[PDB]
Each structure stands twice: as structure tokens, then as C-alpha cells.
Design a protein around this ligand. Structure first.
Ligand SMILES: C[C@@H](NC(=O)c1cc(C(=O)N[C@@H](Cc2ccccc2)[C@H](O)CNCCC2CCN(Cc3ccccc3)CC2)cc(N(C)S(C)(=O)=O)c1)c1ccccc1
Length: 374
């Protein structure tokens, strides 16, 4: 397709985050940047760190402009402190443009960088509302759209076990099968969506849909897990246990505190259930559902003869987070121009001969507006 040079522009090292190459400054300094739809700051390591092999050297960039302002960003996991400035930025396997963007130079950090992950910075792709220090700091994608012809849309295919594609300015049809189904972006801060029903192996969890979105639900490539509010998590685990009852696992397995390992190639995927989230559709009273497999929610942990797994659905107190566990099933289109997020079955998603991830619709769901928290 026309976007062929952007295909396979993502990498990941042992499932520690999906990253794209970005080139900053003049002369060029290329760094590996984690793609994060769950935050809105573009920040790069800019000083030595034990887990960094490279970092941004501002003094070597003739085009660097100091903003004379500090910045601090805490995440659910980790935090960093740094210094704001602007510089020229291109994505060599992305759009054919160069923009002047805000960049946070990370000088100190706590549990942010990940040993062996091979990434050295983060690209926050969400909206200005959640940027630090405040919403006046234009996020990267906003700058790209304001300064260039590039359409206000990007799409992500995260390929689990690895790699994937970030298509910028459009969609590449080779990256998915079947149809794309869209859910509204409820509000432009996080990529906020509304979940209207949850099923485990076709069985309705039967919770009030308000519980699924308390206090928000977001699509977040920078978060590994499917994170669920406590009440929802507990109900989900109870149902998943019931569905997989032909095998018993320690309580701590469901809490992510214990791993279970199988002999290489023998993992009984079939004994674990599929999980479906229904999302609000584009038409009144219309929904669709996305369905993931245990291959998505049971994550490998790297004897070479043993395949060890961690259960990667976990508890949150800050609403639902549809992280990599969800996104790895799908090609996800962040259609900012039309304030909607599209899902289609990923051409690269991990499955088996018996089951596949699915995106299906339409369904009829009433009173979906009520599901959202106010
Ligand atoms: C890079 C790595 N990410 C993580 O290991 C990870 C990052 C995060 C995380 O915070 N990611 C942020 C970006 C990041 C951080 C650190 C290293 C690399 C990337 C995202 O930006 C978070 N997105 C926003 C989440 C909301 C934040 C605000 N809050 C509400 C709140 C709470 C307190 C105070 C104010 C507001 C709700 C959730 C979280 C978590 N979890 C808590 S978990 C075990 O359930 O999966 C795991 C990864 C590995 C594989 C695939 C994708 C990503």
C-alpha cells in the first residue's frame, strides 16, 4: 500500500514496550522511543542512566532551544524529572516531514527506564489536557498536525509473542482482516472510551456497566495489562476461574504474584476462556465487541525448555486500562479527526488453530450513555 515504508516500524525487546525510532536535533541523534497512547509528553533520556545505552545530548544540537522550565511526570509505574526545550524531530520510518516539537530532556528518573528494553524515551500520543506541566505544552502529535499536511490520525498494530507498525496519517489495509468497527472518543484527554458489557466465554459478567467505566476507561499502549476496577477485577477472576476449572492454579497466579510454566509447546490454551469487551458504537443503541484469547492475557516471561506465563489482567483503582493485553489482539485506529477509535482483528495477533481474536457487530445495547462516569 501507499504506507508500506511505515509497516514494521515498531520493535520490542522481550515484551518490555513497543518503540519507534525518532531522530532529534541537528546533526541527527536517533533514539528508540516508546509509543504511549496513555500520556502526552514527548521525553527522552538526556543523561547517563544504568539502563540507557544512548541519550540525547542537547549541547551537540545546534537547533535545540531551551525553554528554561523544569518538568516532572509521574506515571502509574515510574516517574522522571527533566528540562523542557524544543528541537527538530523526524520519524525516519514514519511520515516524510520534520517538525519543531516540545521535548522533555530526562535528567533523573525513578523506576521508569526498563533494563534491557532498548528504549530511551517515550512518545505521549494522548491529548494536551493531561500533559505536564499543563495543557499549554503542545504534545508531539498536535505539533505534527499543526505544522504539516499529515492527517490527524494514526494507527497501531502491536505484535505480541516483538514488533508491529505505527501508521501515521492513515491506515494500512495489510495490517488487519475483516471490518473496522469504531467507538467514540468520549473526551479528548486520555483516549477515553465506554465499555458497555463484558463476557467471559460468551457469559455475561452481569455487572452494572457503570462499574466497567468507573472512573474512566482508556486505551493505553504504554500499559502492559488489562487493568480493571477492583469490583470488576474480582468478578472477572471468579468467572475466569470457573471457566478454566478443569485445571487448578494457586490464588496468587490470578494476582500476578505467581507464574505457572509448561513444557515448551504444551500450554493448554484451550482450557482458558476468551474475554469480550463490548464498546459503544457510532450509532444510537448500537455496540460491537472485541474478543481476546489467553494468548493475549497470559504473557510469556523469558529453562529454555519451560514456557512460563504471568496472568496479565490486574486490579486498578483509577478505572479500566485497555493496555497491550487488549491492543495486541487488534489493529487500533486512533482517528482523532473524527473523534473515534477503530478496532479490527490484527493480521499479526497470536492465536491457534482453534480460536482467533474477533471484532464483531453490531449488537443492540440500550442506555449506553449512562455507562460513563461524570
Ligand atoms: C513499557 C511497558 N509498560 C509497563 O510495564 C507498565 C507501564 C505502566 C504505566 O504507568 N505506563 C505509562 C507509561 C510508562 C510508564 C513507565 C514506563 C514506560 C511507560 C502510561 O502513560 C500510563 N497511562 C495512564 C494511566 C492512568 C494514569 C492516571 N490514573 C489516575 C490517577 C492516579 C493517581 C494520580 C492521578 C491520577 C489512571 C491510570 C503501568 C503498568 N502497570 C501498572 S501494569 C503491571 O498493570 O501493566 C505497566 C510495556 C510493556 C509491554 C507492552 C506495553 C508497555
Amino acid at each position: 500500500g501507499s504506507f508500506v515504508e511505515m509497516v514494521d516500524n515498531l520493535r520490542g525487546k522481550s515484551g518490555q514496550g513497543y518503540y519507534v525510532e525518532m531522530t532529534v536535533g541537528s546533526p541527527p541523534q536517533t533514539l528508540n522511543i516508546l509509543v504511549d497512547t496513555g500520556s502526552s509528553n514527548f521525553a527522552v533520556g538526556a543523561a547517563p542512566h544504568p539502563f540507557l545505552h544512548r541519550y540525547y545530548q542537547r549541547q551537540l544540537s545546534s537547533t535545540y532551544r531551551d525553554l528554561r522550565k523544569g518538568v516532572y511526570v509521574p506515571y502509574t509505574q515510574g516517574a522522571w524529572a527533566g528540562e523542557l526545550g524544543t528541537d527538530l524531530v523526524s520519524i525516519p520510518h514514519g511520515p516524510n516531514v520534520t517538525v519543531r516539537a516540545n521535548i522533555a530532556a530526562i535528567t533523573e528518573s525513578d523506576k521508569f527506564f526498563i533494563n534491557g528494553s532498548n528504549w530511551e524515551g517515550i512518545l505521549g500520543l494522548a491529548y494536551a489536557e493531561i500533559a505536564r506541566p499543563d495543557d499549554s505544552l503542545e504534545p508531539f502529535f498536535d505539533s505534527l498536525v499543526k505544522q504539516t499536511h499529515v492527517p490527524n490520525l494514526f494507527s497501531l498494530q502491536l505484535c505480541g509473542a516483538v514488533g508491529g507498525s505505527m501508521i501515521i496519517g492513515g491506515i494500512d489495509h495489510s495490517l488487519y482482516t475483516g471490518s473496522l468497527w469504531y467507538t467514540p472518543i468520549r473526551r479528548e484527554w486520555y483516549y477515553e472510551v465506554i465499555i458497555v458489557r463484558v463476557e467471559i466465554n460468551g457469559q455475561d459478567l452481569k455487572m452494572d456497566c457503570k462499574e466497567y467505566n468507573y472512573d474512566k476507561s482508556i486505551v493505553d499502549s504504554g500499559t502492559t495489562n488489562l487493568r480493571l476496577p477492583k469490583k470488576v477485577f474480582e468478578a472477572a477472576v471468579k468467572s475466569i476461574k470457573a471457566a478454566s476449572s478443569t485445571e487448578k492454579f494457586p490464588d496468587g497466579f490470578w494476582l500476578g504474584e505467581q507464574l505457572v510454566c509448561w513444557q515448551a509447546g504444551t500450554t493448554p490454551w484451550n482450557i482458558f476462556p476468551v474475554i469480550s469487551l463490548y464498546l459503544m458504537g457510532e450509532v444510537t443503541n448500537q455496540s460491537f465487541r472485541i474478543t481476546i484469547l489467553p494468548q493475549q492475557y497470559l504473557r510469556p516471561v523469558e529453562t529454555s525448555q519451560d514456557d512460563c506465563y504471568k496472568f496479565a489482567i490486574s486490579q486498578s483503582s483509577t478505572g479500566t486500562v485497555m493496555g497491550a493485553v487488549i491492543m495486541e489482539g487488534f489493529y487500533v485506529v486512533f482517528d482523532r479527526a473524527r473523534k473515534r477509535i477503530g478496532f479490527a482483528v490484527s493480521a499479526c495477533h497470536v492465536h491457534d488453530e482453534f480460536r482467533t481474536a474477533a471484532v464483531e457487530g453490531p449488537f443492540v445495547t440500550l442506555d449506553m450513555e449512562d455507562c460513563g462516569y461524570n
